C-alpha cells in the first residue's frame, strides 16, 4: 500500500468499514445508495455541483464541514464520531471526498475554493474524486447492504 491506487483502495476500505461498524441500518442503506450514485453524479454534473448538492442536502456550510475535518487527525480517519446524534449520509460522503482531496490534491479544496481555482486543478480534483468514489462504490457493494 504505497502507490496512489493502493492508498485509494485502503482508504475507501476504512471509511466504508466505519459505516458498517456503526451498525445503523438506516444510515448504512441511505449511504450505500448515495455512494453508488456519486461517481455518476460527478461525471454528468461535475465536482463543484455534486459537493454543493451534498452540503445543501445536509443543510450545512463548507465552514462547518472544514471545522469537522480539522478534527480528523488520525489514520485510519474517524468521521462518523465527529458528527452529531444525527448522522447525515450526505455530509458524511462530503467529508469522505473532501478529506481525500485535501490530502492528495490540495489542502484548501472545498465548495467555495472550487469556484475560483484554475481548470487544471478542478479537472485533477474531479478525476481524483471519481477514482476515489469508484473504490468506495466497489467496497460498499462488497461490505454494505440496503
From Swiss-Prot:
Annotated GO biological process: defense response to virus
Keywords: Antiviral defense, Cytoplasm
Recorded GO CC terms: cytoplasm
Major localisation: cytoplasm
Subcellular location: Cytoplasm
InterPro entries membership: AF1862-like_dom_sf, CRISPR-assoc_prot_Cmr5
Family: Belongs to the CRISPR system Cmr5 family.
Subunit structure: Monomer in isolation. Part of the type III-B Cmr ribonucleoprotein (RNP) complex, an elongated RNP with Cmr2 and Cmr3 as the base, with Cmr4 and Cmr5 forming a helical core along the mature crRNA (39 or 45 nt in length), while the complex is capped by Cmr6 and Cmr1. The 5' end of the crRNA is bound to Cmr2 and Cmr3, while Cmr6 and a Cmr1 subunit (Cmr1-1 or Cmr1-2) cap the 3' end of the crRNA.
NCBIfam families, alphabetized: cas_Cmr5 (TIGR01881)
The protein's name in its UniProt record: CRISPR system Cmr subunit Cmr5
Organism: Pyrococcus furiosus (strain ATCC 43587 / DSM 3638 / JCM 8422 / Vc1)
Lineage: Archaea, Methanobacteriati, Methanobacteriota, Thermococci, Thermococcales
Gene that encodes the chain: cmr5
